[PDB]
Ligand binder design. Structure first.
Ligand SMILES: *NC1=N[C@@]23[C@@H](N1)[C@H](COC(N)=O)N=C(N*)N2CCC3(O)O
Length: 818
C-alpha cells in the first residue's frame, strides 16, 4: 500500500516528489525519505525507515554485509544469445504498456521475429535478425521503398556444422564450451562465438581443460579514465596527479581503478589487512575529489559547501559520473574515472581516453581502452525482503504507465541510471553472490579484506540441517583440527558456500551434480555401496568390481507378456515419485528422446506418478491412504500416498499397474519371504521380469545388462585447488573412523546416534578417490549413458541462477555475429 524510496540528495528529493505528484500507480503510494548520502540511505533501509534504493554494482557486496544487510531485488535485464521466445515476451511487454503509438514487436505463428518490423504510428519499417536487432541501414521512412528483408536466423555453430572438424552445438544451436575433434583426439575450450580460447588445447590421453560457459551479451558499460587532450601524461604516470572520481564505493570510480593499479604494480600497497586501500590511494594521488573518502587530500578538490563536501550525494557537485566530468572540465583534476555512459560526441574535441597500456585513444574506442566492464546497478532492499512485492508492483506499474523514472530536468542519474531502459524482478534466490557472479564476488571479497586464507590441512564440511550439524560437530571435536563445520539450508546452498570460499567439500546426490560440475567443482570422492566386496575399502589400490550403483529398470509382471519397451505408449505406468532419478528422470528422458512428440502427460494411460497434477492422467489409480477418509492425499510427494516410494511403485505393478520404473532392489526387497506382512506376502521374484531397451525381457537378476540406465553414485565434491588436500584428509579420517577404522569405537563416519543418513548415507561402505580420466568431466562423472540420457551430452540442458553466476558474460556490440 506504501513504498518509501530513499533519496540521497536534494535533487533526488525533487525528482522523487515530482514522481509522487505525476506517477499514479493504483493502491500504492510513493513516499520520499531524504538522507544526506548513500550510506545513510542504506542505514535507513536497514532500520526500516526506508524500503528501497538503487545501488551501483560496486556497493552490492558491502551492502550484503553488516551494518547494512541488503539484497538486490530489481535489476535491468541484459539481452543475450540465451533468450528464448524473445519476440513473444517483448510483444507482451509492449502491449502491457498504457500508451498509444509505440513499437509492438510483430512475431509470426511460431513466435519468431518477423524479418520486417514496422512502427505503425511512424510508418518506419526495418529488417531484423532472429534476436530482433535492426540490420544496419534497413530503416526505411514512410513513402520510401522498403528494404527487402531476408531471414537472418541460421546460428553460426550450425553453419559451421554444415560445409563440413565438426563442432558440437546445443539444442538452441549455440556453441558448446567444450569442443572435441573426432579426426584428431583433441579437446579445447571456445568463446561464445566458437573462437578458441588460448591455452586450453590438450593432446589425447591428457585430461581436458575445464571449459566455462559463455553468454554473449550486448550494451555493456565500462569504467574509463577520461583526460583532456592538452595534457601529456600516461597511465603509469598517474602517481601525484589530481583525480576526480564518481565515488569511493563505485566500480567505475574506484574499484576497477584500484584493481588495474595493483595489477600493473603501480600502487604501493601491502594488503587489505595491513593497510586500508584509502591510505595507499591518498599516498598515490596528490589532491583529488573522491566522494565518500575519509582522507583529507582525497576530498580537497570537491566543491561541496560546509556539510555537503565530499558526500556520496549530488549535494556534492562533483559526485557521480557527470560530477567527475565536471571536476575534470573545471580543471580541478587531471584525470576523471567514470562510466562510459558519460561519454559523448560533444566531448570528442577536448577530451580523450587514458588506457592502461600507457597510450591515449579517442572516446569512441572505450571498448578497447577501459578499466573493465561495469555491471548495471540494482534496486536493493532488506535481506528479509518484507517489501519486495510492493516495490516491484510499484516499479512495474510505473514502467507500464510511462512515468519519468529514468530521466529528469533536475539532473542526470537521479534515483536510477539514466541509461536504464527497463527494470525487471530478480529471482528471490539472488543475493550479492548470485548477482555479481562468482569471479566478481571473489574479487570484491578480496578487495574488501574478507578473503579467506586457505588451509591445506583443514577441511570445512558443509551441513544441510541441524542433525548433520551435530554429527559434524562430533566428527570435528574427534578429528583433531582436520574437520570444521559450516551450516547451510540445502545442498545447493553448500555448493554456493564452496564457491564463495566459505566451505570446502560437500556430498551431493546426482540430482545436484550437473550444476556443481557446471560451476567448476570436481568430485573429490565417490561413495562405495558394494555391500559384498570390501576390497577397494580395505586397501585403496584394489580395483572396484562394482560400486553398488543403483540401476534404473522397468519391472513388469510375468503374467503380462505383451508389455515391451517399444509398447510403452499408453498402458498404466508406475513411478516412485516426481523428481526421483530411477522412477522418473530416466524414463521421462528416454521417452522424450525416442518419441519426438514428447508429451508424457498424454504418453501413458492412468499412470501413477506422485507429484503430478491431481487432475492429469499421471495421478489416476493412486489410492491415497487406505484408512483416512478425512483428507484427500492422492498424488502426494510423501508417505501419505500409498503409491509413493519404491515400495509404493512396486505395489503399483502388483495391484493396478503394468510397468513400474524403479531401482532394481525393490523387486528383491518386496518378495521371496523378505517382504512385508500384507500385500507382498506370497509374491515371488520369479513372477517378475525387466524391460530391456531392445524390446525384449529378462529375469530380474539381469539388472546389469537389462537396464534403462545406470545411476552415478553420490559424490563428495570440492574446488579443484583443494582436491589433493580434501582426498588426503578424507583418506586419513577413514583409517580412523571408517568401518574398519582404528578408532571406530570413538566415531563412525557412516553411522550416528544423532540420526540416519547424515553427511553420508548410512549404507555407504567407504569413500573411493575419484579417478580423473582424460575426458569430459561430466562424461567422466555421469558417464556417457547417463550424460546423454538426461542432459543430452549438453552444457545447456539446464538453466538456473547459479549457472548464470558461474557463466562468463562475453560483451559484444550485437548478436548479429550469429
Ligand atoms: N574414473 C572413474 N569414473 C567412473 C569410475 N571410475 C568409478 C567407479 O564407478 C563404478 N565402477 O561404478 N566411479 C564413477 N562414479 N565413475 C563415473 C564413470 C566411471 O565408471 O568411469
Amino acid at each position: 500500500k506504501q513504498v518509501r524510496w530513499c533519496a540521497i540528495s536534494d535533487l533526488e528529493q525533487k525528482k522523487c516528489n515530482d514522481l509522487v505528484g505525476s506517477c499514479n500507480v493504483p493502491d500504492i503510494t510513493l513516499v520520499c525519505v531524504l538522507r544526506s548520502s548513500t550510506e545513510d540511505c542504506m542505514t535507513a533501509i536497514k532500520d526500516g525507515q526506508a524500503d528501497a534504493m538503487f545501488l551501483d554494482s560496486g556497493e552490492v557486496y558491502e551492502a550484503s554485509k553488516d551494518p547494512y544487510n541488503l539484497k538486490p531485488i530489481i535489476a535491468e535485464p541484459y539481452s543475450s544469445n540465451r533468450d528464448l521466445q524473445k519476440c513473444l515476451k517483448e510483444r507482451q511487454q509492449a502491449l502491457a504498456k498504457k500508451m498509444i503509438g509505440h513499437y509492438i514487436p510483430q512475431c509470426d505463428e511460431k513466435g519468431n521475429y518477423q524479418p520486417q518490423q514496422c512502427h505503425g504510428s511512424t510508418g518506419h519499417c526495418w529488417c531484423v535478425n532472429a534476436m530482433g536487432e535492426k540490420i544496419s541501414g534497413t530503416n526505411t521512412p514512410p513513402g520510401q521503398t522498403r528494404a527487402t528483408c531476408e531471414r537472418h536466423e541460421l546460428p553460426k555453430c550450425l553453419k559451421e556444422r554444415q560445409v563440413a572438424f565438426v563442432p558440437q552445438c546445443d539444442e538452441k544451436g549455440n556453441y558448446e564450451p567444450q569442443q572435441f575433434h573426432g579426426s584428431t583426439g583433441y579437446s579445447w575450450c571456445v568463446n561464445a562465438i566458437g573462437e578458441e580460447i588460448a591455452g586450453t588445447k590438450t593432446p589425447p590421453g591428457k585430461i581436458p581443460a575445464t571449459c566455462q560457459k559463455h553468454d554473449l551479451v550486448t550494451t555493456c558499460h565500462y569504467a574509463v579514465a577520461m583526460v583532456k587532450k592538452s595534457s601529456a601524461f600516461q597511465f603509469n604516470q598517474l602517481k601525484g596527479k589530481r583525480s576526480c572520481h564518481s565515488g569511493v564505493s563505485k566500480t567505475d570510480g574506484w574499484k576497477a581503478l584500484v584493481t588495474v593499479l595493483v595489477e600493473k604494480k603501480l600502487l604501493s600497497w601491502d594488503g587489505p589487512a595491513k593497510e586500508s586501500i584509502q591510505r595507499a590511494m591518498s599516498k598515490f594521488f596528490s589532491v583529488s575529489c573522491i566522494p565518500g573518502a575519509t582522507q583529507t587530500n582525497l576530498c580537497k578538490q570537491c566543491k561541496g559547501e560546509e556539510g555537503k563536501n565530499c558526500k556520496n550525494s549530488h549535494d556534492e557537485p562533483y559526485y557521480g559520473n557527470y560530477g567527475a566530468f565536471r571536476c575534470l572540465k573545471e580543471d580541478m583534476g587531471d584525470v576523471a574515472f567514470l562510466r562510459s555512459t558519460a561519454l559523448s560526441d560533444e566531448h570528442s574535441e577536448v577530451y580523450e581516453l587514458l588506457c592502461p597500456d600507457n597510450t591515449r585513444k579517442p572516446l569512441n574506442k572505450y571498448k578497447e581502452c577501459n578499466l573493465g566492464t561495469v555491471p548495471a546497478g540494482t534496486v536493493v532492499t532488506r535481506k528479509i525482503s518484507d517489501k519486495t512485492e510492493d516495490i516491484n508492483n510499484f516499479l512495474m506499474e510505473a514502467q507500464k504507465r510511462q512515468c519519468k523514472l529514468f530521466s529528469s530536468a533536475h539532473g542526470k542519474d537521479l534515483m536510477f541510471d539514466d541509461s536504464t531502459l527497463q527494470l525487471a524482478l530478480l529471482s528471490s534466490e539472488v543475493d550479492a553472490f548470485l548477482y555479481l557472479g562468482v569471479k566478481l564476488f571473489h574479487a570484491m571479497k578480496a578487495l574488501t579484506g574478507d578473503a579467506h586464507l586457505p588451509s591445506k590441512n583443514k577441511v570445512r564440511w558443509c551441513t544441510i540441517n541441524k542433525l548433520e550439524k551435530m554429527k559434524c560437530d562430533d566428527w570435528s571435536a574427534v578429528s583433531g583440527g582436520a574437520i570444521a563445520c559450516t551450516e547451510a539450508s540445502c545442498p545447493k546452498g553448500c555448493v554456493k558456500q564452496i564457491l564463495k570460499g566459505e566451505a570446502d567439500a560437500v556430498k551431493l546426490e546426482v540430482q545436484y551434480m550437473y550444476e556443481a560440475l557446471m560451476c567448476g567443482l570436481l568430485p573429490a570422492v565417490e561413495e562405495y555401496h558394494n555391500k559384498d566386496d570390501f576390497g577397494p575399502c580395505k586397501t585403496p589400490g584394489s580395483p572396484a568390481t562394482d560400486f553398488g550403483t543403483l540401476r534404473a529398470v522397468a519391472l513388469v509382471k510375468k503374467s503380462n507378456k505383451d508389455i515391451n519397451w517399444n509398447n510403452i505408449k499408453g498402458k498404466k505406468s508406475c513411478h516412485t515419485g516426481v523428481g526421483d532419478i530411477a522412477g522418473w528422470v530416466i524414463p521421462v528422458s528416454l521417452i522424450r528422446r525416442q518419441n519426438d512428440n514428447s508429451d508424457i502427460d498424454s504418453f501413458f494411460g492412468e499412470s501413477c506418478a506422485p507429484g503430478s497434477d491431481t487432475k492429469s492422467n499421471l495421478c489416476k489409480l493412486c489410492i491415497g491412504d487406505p484408512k483416512n477418509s478425512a483428507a484427500n492425499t492422492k498424488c502426494s510427494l510423501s508417505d501419505k500416498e500409498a503409491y509413493y516410494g519404491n515400495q509404493g511403485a512396486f505395489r503399483c505393478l502388483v495391484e493396478k499397474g503394468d510397468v513400474a520404473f524403479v531401482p532394481h532392489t525393490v523387486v528383491f526387497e518386496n518378495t521371496d519371504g523378505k517382504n512385508p506382512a500384507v500385500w507382498a506376502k506370497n509374491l515371488k521374484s520369479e513372477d517378475f521380469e525387466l524391460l530391456c531397451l531392445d524390446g525384449s525381457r529378462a529375469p530380474v537378476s539381469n539388472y546389469k545388462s537389462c537396464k534403462l540406465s545406470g545411476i552415478p553414485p553420490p559424490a563428495i565434491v570440492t574446488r579443484e585447488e583443494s582436491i589433493s588436500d580434501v582426498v588426503r584428509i578424507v583418506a586419513n579420517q577413514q583409517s580412523l573412523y571408517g568401518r574398519k577404522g582404528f578408532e571406530k569405537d570413538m566415531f563412525q563416519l557412516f553411522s550416528s546416534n544423532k540420526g540416519n543418513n547424515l553427511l553420508f548415507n548410512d549404507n555407504t561402505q567407504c569413500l573411493i578417490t575419484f579417478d580423473r580420466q582424460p575426458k569430459d568431466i561430466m562424461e567422466d562423472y555421469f558417464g556417457k549413458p547417463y550424460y546423454t540420457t538426461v542432459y543430452g551430452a549438453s552444457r545447456s540442458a539446464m538453466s538456473s541462477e547459479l549457472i548464470s553466476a558461474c557463466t562468463i558474460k562475453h560483451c559484444s556490440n550485437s548478436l548479429e555475429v550469429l
